[PDB]
Curated annotation (Swiss-Prot):
It comes from Arabidopsis thaliana. Binds to the ATPase domain of HSP70/HSC70 chaperones. Interacts with HSP70-1. It comes from the Eukaryota. This is BAG family molecular chaperone regulator 3. Residues 5-83 form the BAG domain. The chain holds residues 135 to 220 of 303 of the full protein. Co-chaperone that regulates diverse cellular pathways, such as programmed cell death and stress responses.
Length: 87
């Protein structure tokens, strides 16, 4: 069922978010981490996002691409404002 799949994704993303927080703590304490550990984590999160989208869209790749382009805008817009604000 799509319901249980979404639940599992929720659980897994909670786990990955816990790992992100921990890495943020390492950095805040003065520590050095390898970029590939962070790139790997990004990939793990992206995999969950794609599984979720495939469920939401019932596999329709056009809807999936559309949902992704839509959700990204919020962040791209805030980052654009920051670049122009320029401090």
């Amino acid at each position: 069922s799509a319901s249980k799949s979404i639940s599992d994704i929720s659980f897994e993303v909670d786990r990955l978010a816990g790992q992100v927080s921990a890495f943020e703590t390492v950095i805040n304490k003065g520590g050095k981490v390898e970029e590939k550990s962070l790139v790997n984590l990004i990939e793990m999160l992206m995999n969950q996002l794609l599984r979720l989208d495939a469920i939401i869209a019932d596999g329709d790749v056009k809807l999936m691409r559309k949902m992704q382009v839509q959700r990204v805008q919020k962040y791209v817009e805030a980052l654009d404002l920051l670049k122009v604000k320029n401090s």
